[PDB]
Design a protein around this ligand. Structure first.
Ligand SMILES: Nc1ncnc2c1ncn2[C@@H]1O[C@H](C[C@@H](N)CC[C@H](N)C(=O)O)[C@@H](O)[C@H]1O
Ligand SMILES: Nc1ncnc2c1ncn2[C@@H]1O[C@H](C[C@@H](N)CC[C@H](N)C(=O)O)[C@@H](O)[C@H]1O
Lengths: 170, 173
């Protein structure tokens, strides 16, 4: 199919900087994704989000704003949460590529995937992470492993697109 | 072992005529997150600047060590190989590598103390035909054809991320 990417929900939890929402929206659009969900964002709507969303204001316009992570994950068949610190057994830890493979398996099965991203400052709570079935870590310099929020979104969606293309022989 | 990590230092990130200083800071952070250190800026419109420092949270060291130059030729001096980036994956000039092939070509070239430059363009205009001609390889990140180009910092992040992924795999991870 090609409407597969529309079944990927990008969930941003309690975003502090509105420019990161715009940046995430742009990263999404560049990769073929459209469904953005915001859980209690600090400031939204906001000019800085629009500013950073060059060519992707439509995503921001269609964004769902909710009060809880539970509400954000409603209807999903699989939830993958991002972690920049590291592993919690028994939850499996995957890299961006493995994340992409799982996403497409679920999409091909006609499921709904959710990709969860945390706060710039604190990330995701343990409680939030536990609502996920898989955890995803972007390999990085251990002394400086925290990527900008929108940049993390870009890496994941990129891998997702790469996996989707390959599944098509592209 | 240890000089494995030193390989990444030999990868020069070149930003050509950057308009928004936030993008310079974003690029620097993306580089640092991936283990890269060397930033070269060709005629930035505004630098140094506060937005760059802010965007480069924790990666100010890269900004500090950045070299600012008048020409691309200057920027590439001492490099071994040059890879350029193209937002368009249109057919007419010079066959394109994806980020993965790009990561591999970059690593192969780090052999025998080689120096590699990764070149990025202007937020609106990209790289000129002349600038691209200075590149031996041209890289395109696959993206939705119907829509736009990636933000400049986001593009630096994808390429540097692929470089780290290849570099890690080569070590057994
Ligand atoms: N290396 C990474 N792997 C996976 N996600 C990351 C990574 N770096 C940043 N992110 C994402 O970016 C969001 C915002 C980060 N700045 C938060 C970092 C926070 N200190 C943490 O411990 O995760 C994180 O919650 C993740 O969603
Ligand atoms: N899909 C992509 N593939 C390779 N590089 C990209 C891609 N998207 C953005 N970039 C990089 O980010 C820079 C700035 C872009 N926003 C410029 C887009 C411009 N309209 C063009 O067609 O070049 C480009 O010069 C590239 O360095």
């Amino acid at each position: 199919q090609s409407m597969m990417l529309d079944r990927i929900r990008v969930v941003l939890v309690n975003t502090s900087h509105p420019g990161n929402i715009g940046g995430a929206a742009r990263a999404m659009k560049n990769m073929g994704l459209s469904q953005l969900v915001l859980v209690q964002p600090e400031s939204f709507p906001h000019g800085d989000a629009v500013a950073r969303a060059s060519g992707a204001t439509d995503i921001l316009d269609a964004a769902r704003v909710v009060d809880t992570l539970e509400e954000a994950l409603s209807g999903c068949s699989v939830v993958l949460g991002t972690s920049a610190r590291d592993r919690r057994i028994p939850w499996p830890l995957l890299d961006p590529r493995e994340c992409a493979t799982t996403c497409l398996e679920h999409l091909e099965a006609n499921g709904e995937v959710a990709l969860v991203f945390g706060r710039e400052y604190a990330g995701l709570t343990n409680e939030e992470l536990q609502r996920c079935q898989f955890h995803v870590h972007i390999p990085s310099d251990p002394e400086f492993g925290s990527l900008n929020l929108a940049a993390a979104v870009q890496v994941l969606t990129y891998e997702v697109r790469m996996a989707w293309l390959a599944a098509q022989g592209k």
